[PDB]
Write a protein that binds this DNA or RNA. Structure first.
Length: 50
DNA sequence: GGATGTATATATCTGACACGTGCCTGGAGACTAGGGAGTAATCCCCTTGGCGGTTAAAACGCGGGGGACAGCGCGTACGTG
């Protein structure tokens, strides 16, 4: 993913781990990026490697 | 025996150089003020990398026909003496 694309409607339920290669200046973009996979109904424990 | 081509010596031209001279303009020395270098603050404009959405402009393909170009004639206007 490019971090600032796709809006808030991207559904990524099947993924488990999120790796942030480049840290954003705005942390809310990173929170939205990790909430792409941490949506309601996720069946796995999500970890983020920065 | 008369006439002809070449070789060293002296007078004259001719630009360049040594010397003379004026004078005026550039250089040496001193002083000063101000123009520019440096510093700090503030705020607006520009840079590089991204995103989203509109949409009008750009790209591509194809028919066809108008125009560029080649060939030929001619007669006149310009070259030449």
């Amino acid at each position: 993913l490019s971090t600032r694309a796709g809006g808030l409607g991207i559904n990524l339920m099947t993924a488990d781990t999120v790796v942030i290669f480049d840290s954003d200046w705005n942390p809310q973009a990173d929170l939205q990026a990790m909430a792409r996979a941490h949506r309601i109904g996720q069946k796995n424990h999500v970890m983020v490697y920065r």
